[model samples]
Target: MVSKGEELFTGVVPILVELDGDVNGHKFSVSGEGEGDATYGKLTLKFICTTGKLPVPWPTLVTTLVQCFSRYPDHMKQHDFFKSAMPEGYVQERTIFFKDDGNYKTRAEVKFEGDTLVNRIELKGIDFKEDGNILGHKLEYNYNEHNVYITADKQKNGIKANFKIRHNIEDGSVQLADHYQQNTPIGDGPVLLPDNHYLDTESALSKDPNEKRDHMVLLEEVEAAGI
Candidate 1:
């Protein structure tokens, strides 16, 4: 339900094959700026999957991320990049949540750093189901500089799945830089923002349209989506 521009930032709109699901494809849109730097930027990664008539289980949703990360060397390497930024064996926890409609909402917190992903907690609430279940799970990951060597985790049913990701230095481009996302579900459509919510021009300079480029790179990306 994200707008076109937001979808593009979240990697949602264009529909990458790796993101499809059995039911209906889900889309992701992300936007955030770095805390204190001109280098700040925003990006979105979306996955288009079939939406089944019934609600999807939270475990299934996590599986989709695991599958997508397994196939993409770039994403795996990005994990490495973040690991390298921290001391060996360092761990960090991140919380993420999103809700678009009043009927459903999702929330997750993951503890991971370097080549290891330790704790994962997720929850999904549906209007029809007054009682929500926990999707908490633990996992271990092993990786060398080049690739993710192992992934072993337990599912809700207590079944174990182990996976491996082979490395190709040339192909791995995903790196952990800065991560940010919005919890609310966004509607799909054209790219539009509140009037005067300028994305780029400096506050003082924004007053003079001539001083601006008269267009933005994001605008072009949106136009290309329809073409």
Candidate 2:
């Protein structure tokens, strides 16, 4: 049986969690930027939600994120943050504190299935201002799958999302899909090429009208099972 070639077969990394915040009491949309030297930098994770704006402390946003990480093991190239079919580490405890620079950072990073943690980010100043309506705090990183996203305003059920998986029938390379999770709306759509026009999931996307169709879909199924 042919299996997904480390994502090359499906053009997707099983799945990706958008972020760790909330929007419409469900989904969360945000734009942020954080850069530091070697020791100190104030990184406050911010996102844009419908109606009004709010602060998203990611380190303690929710449990679903780590859970999501567990579900998608071996998704990344260098690491798999979760191990033993479970979160090797705790999501976050109340012990989350602050530093002198007003940015609360920590060196305690997640232990991936194979890799460890960052050299510096693991213990940096986190400028996350805690808020309400959240069980866990927002984090420096969770899961940001660009191929899939929540595109709605007000819906009680975690908000509505659209899954448009894409593939590169040519080179077989999929970039980390977490652009939307950053400081801007990242929607250029799959590696639309003029060659064979290879898309990841044909059923999930289509080049129908609106404008020129630089990207194409996979009409037939690319089986990747029992490898």
Candidate 3:
């Protein structure tokens, strides 16, 4: 039997993702690690369409998608945000008004439980009956209880996709929650790697279901889609 203080596995793995809505012409990838008893959570996501029309430029609009799910990981501390010289929050920078008629906005909160990432992104200032469906295609992306969902669908066509990525303790190679104790400090510093870091896709799929893909590919696909 494993001892309580034993070091747990600390590596990345692909998040099991479900896709829908004419996915034949697009590429999608979701990966992260929320293991080792809440010590750390890392997420990497990619979505690209090689052929389509985007109402909003991918760089301008999709960046919100990135912002929506990016902070789900506890890799950065709350104090770090206050100290950093980063610009205004995403809602203002992205000009994401919760309502067309009002100057409302959305809020985000991320928490961790054991090896799970709990995220909540919602609108403020009003009781929105339906979740924030930003830009008419995107739904409020929330990561809670090991399950996360995000969707994009335009009225006519363009970007129509759905993602139901999940983190399952049994699916990963980490020891069961009660079997190991984690002693590492979360978010020691800024992430060193750029978003486009590459991994060997062959070996990535050989042992696991998928791998972390290069963000560059997503950018290229977005350009090709005529964003």
- Tell me each candidate's TM-score: 0.20, 0.19, 0.23
Model 3 residue 31 CA deviation in Å: 14
Local error of candidate 1 at residue 124 (angstroms): 4.2
* Minimal lDDT window, size 10, model 1: 218-227
Count clashing pairs, candidate 3.
0
lDDT of each: 0.21, 0.22, 0.22
- Pairs of residues at least 3 apart in sequence or in different chains that clash in candidate 3: none
Query: What lDDT score goes with residue 2 in model 2?
Result: 17
Return whichever of 2 and 3 wins on TM-score.
3
lDDT of 1 at 50: 32
In the range 1-227, model 3's lDDT, one tens digit per residue, is 02111112133322222111111122222222322111223244344322334322222122222221222222222212211111111111112332322122323333333433332233222322232232222332212121112222122211112122221222332211110101111233321111211111100011122623322112101100101
Write model 1 residue lDDT over 1-227, tens digit each, in one string.
12221211222212111222222223322221111111122222322223322233322232223111121122223222122211121122222222221122333322223323322223333332222221111111112221112211112111112222221122343212111222111122221211111111111001123422121111111001000
Better TM-score candidate (1, 3): 3
Q: Model 3: how far is 16 from its true place, Å?
A: 11
